[PDB]
Ligand binder design. Structure first.
Ligand SMILES: CN(CC(N)=O)Cc1cccc(Cl)c1
Lengths: 237, 300
């Protein structure tokens, strides 16, 4: 069944599972034509496929050439996502293949099920959680590799940096979802919080700054404040 | 004109013959049904007055033998049987006919309803869906489950309809996932019509038999089969024009005959709205769309 607040801790057990988010697969800018009509121009996108226990991220970059000459692109994007996820699974050794794939948007269920017919024992599940993975393109190093790509490419990251050396997967996922929710609600402010102090750097092989345990607590508090505010600045409370 | 005579009517029962029905009282001097049109399959069906649960009945073709009904007080139902002595049977029937102990199949001459509902239904194909090879007729009841239902538990008592599953390797060619899921023409035309059914007449025969079992017995798995076979055609972009025109006639007479009080349960809202208003064939079923809109506009 669906993944929800009640079965949340299943994400951190020892059954391999992947989240798939397709929000950023088909990305466009909308603009006016010389005749005053509206047109779209695609820009490179990505599939966000994440193991929440280990932090392993399989970022498949979707180059704009895949849309050339195709119709109904928003529909095609879901099937392209499912094709690439199926190809990733087939590329993994059997002992590394997931036992479940959790899609962040329910419209991915049928495309992924059909592409995974050869894997009847991999469960395809929706979720009732409103996860903020669309904000992945607010992480500078991820946005940079997507925008620079000149052809289809898979890039591997650990979205938790080295956090698992000091904290559990549950705590790491909670920190990630906090950071991303902040970036989604007020990107400018969120990035100001993360980078305000010049002396805390991002290692070359990392995505986020090298905060001490104490600095993470302050940062996390600053992100919760931002989210609550915006929720006020929004609903006026 | 053929006859299905009855040994007796020991229990009060509503008896159906095709789309007709009449009530028989307990121990009423009823001895069967005469004037049954030759050239069609027929169904004779029963609902006991004391247990409206379990409608049950028998599909038969009088060209294949002489059949009669005798009530079994042990198994508690009216059973169809074959009489191999033709002289004895013709004599019994003549005696009953002389004493006017039979009802007459009440066909109006202008009326083509039964032909239109059974146009493609063949007794030999019924006997492959309902496997009981020692009899020439076929028993069906409200509770019998289909092979497909069983896969998701007595095999000898199952409805062996052709399994249709839109999210299956049979339906989806490797490499054509999106294509085949969104346009089921290859599954319809190559897998089912060319491969399994062989021709559209056999496909329509099973579709029509499934509907009739749903309508006469409330057989839920037959209703599922009927809708699946409709949905497979409506969800195909490429269908022979003769098949689309025939489907429109088939469905029109099915919707025409359905009891209004059962449309709530026997009509799947999603399939019909998809089929009449969203599918590739949304504009190819004019007669069916017109009767559905004038008879069941609520469902839509
Ligand atoms: C008289 N036999 C029973 C028998 N086997 O002696 C039954 C029967 C057969 C054909 C027509 C009718 Cl209605 C009754």
């Amino acid at each position: 069944g669906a993944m929800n607040s009640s079965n949340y801790a299943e994400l951190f057990n020892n059954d391999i599972k992947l989240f798939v988010d397709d929000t950023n697969v088909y990305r466009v800018t909308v603009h006016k034509t010389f005749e005053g009509n509206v047109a779209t121009k695609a820009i490179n996108g990505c599939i966000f496929t994440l193991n929440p226990k280990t932090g392993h991220l399989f970022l498949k970059i979707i180059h704009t050439s895949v849309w050339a000459g195709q119709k109904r692109l928003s529909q095609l994007a879901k099937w392209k996502t499912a094709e690439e996820v199926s190809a990733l699974v087939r590329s993994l050794p059997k002992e590394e293949q997931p036992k479940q794939i959790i899609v962040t948007r329910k419209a991915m269920l049928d495309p992924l099920e059909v592409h995974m017919l050869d894997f009847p024992n991999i469960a395809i599940r929706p979720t009732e959680l409103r996860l903020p993975f669309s904000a992945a393109m607010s992480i500078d190093k991820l946005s940079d590799v997507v925008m620079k790509a000149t052809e289809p490419q898979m890039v591997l990251f650990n979205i938790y940096d080295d956090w698992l050396d000091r904290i559990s997967s549950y705590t790491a996922f909670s920190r990630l979802t906090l950071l991303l929710r902040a970036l989604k609600t007020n990107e400018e402010s969120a990035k100001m919080i993360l980078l305000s102090d010049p002396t805390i750097t991002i290692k070359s092989y990392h995505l986020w700054p090298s905060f001490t345990d104490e600095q993470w607590i302050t940062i996390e508090s600053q992100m919760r404040d931002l989210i609550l505010t915006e929720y006020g600045r929004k609903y006026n409370v | 004109m053929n006859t299905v005579p009855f040994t007796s009517a020991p229990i009060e029962v509503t008896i159906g013959i095709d789309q007709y029905s009449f009530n028989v009282k307990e121990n009423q001097p009823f001895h069967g049904i005469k004037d049954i049109p030759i050239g069609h399959v027929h169904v004779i069906h029963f609902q006991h007055a004391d247990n409206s649960s379990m409608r049950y009945g028998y599909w038969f073709d009088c060209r294949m033998g002489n059949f009669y009904i005798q009530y079994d007080p042990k198994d508690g139902l009216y059973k169809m049987m074959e009489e191999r002595d033709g002289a004895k049977f013709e004599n019994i029937v003549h005696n009953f006919k002389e004493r006017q102990m039979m009802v007459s199949y009440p066909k109006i001459d202008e009326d083509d309803t039964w032909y239109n509902l059974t146009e493609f239904v063949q007794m030999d194909k019924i006997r492959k869906i309902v496997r009981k090879d020692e009899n020439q007729f076929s028993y069906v009841d409200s509770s019998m489950t289909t092979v497909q239902e069983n896969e998701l538990s007595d095999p000898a008592h199952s409805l062996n309809y052709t399994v249709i599953n839109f999210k299956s390797r049979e339906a989806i060619r490797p490499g054509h996932e999106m294509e085949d899921f969104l346009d089921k023409s290859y599954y319809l035309n190559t897998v089912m019509l060319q491969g399994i059914f062989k021709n559209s007449s056999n496909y329509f025969g099973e579709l029509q038999f499934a509907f009739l079992n749903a309508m006469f017995f409330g057989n839920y798995g037959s209703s599922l089969q009927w809708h699946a076979m409709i949905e497979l055609i409506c969800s195909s972009a490429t269908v022979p024009k003769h098949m689309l025109d025939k489907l429109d006639e088939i469905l029109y007479y099915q919707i025409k005959t359905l009891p209004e009080q059962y449309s709530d349960i026997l009509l799947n809202e999603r399939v019909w709205n998809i089929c009449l208003y969203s599918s590739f064939q949304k504009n190819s079923l004019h007669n069916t769309e017109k009767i559905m809109e004038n008879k069941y506009p609520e469902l839509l």
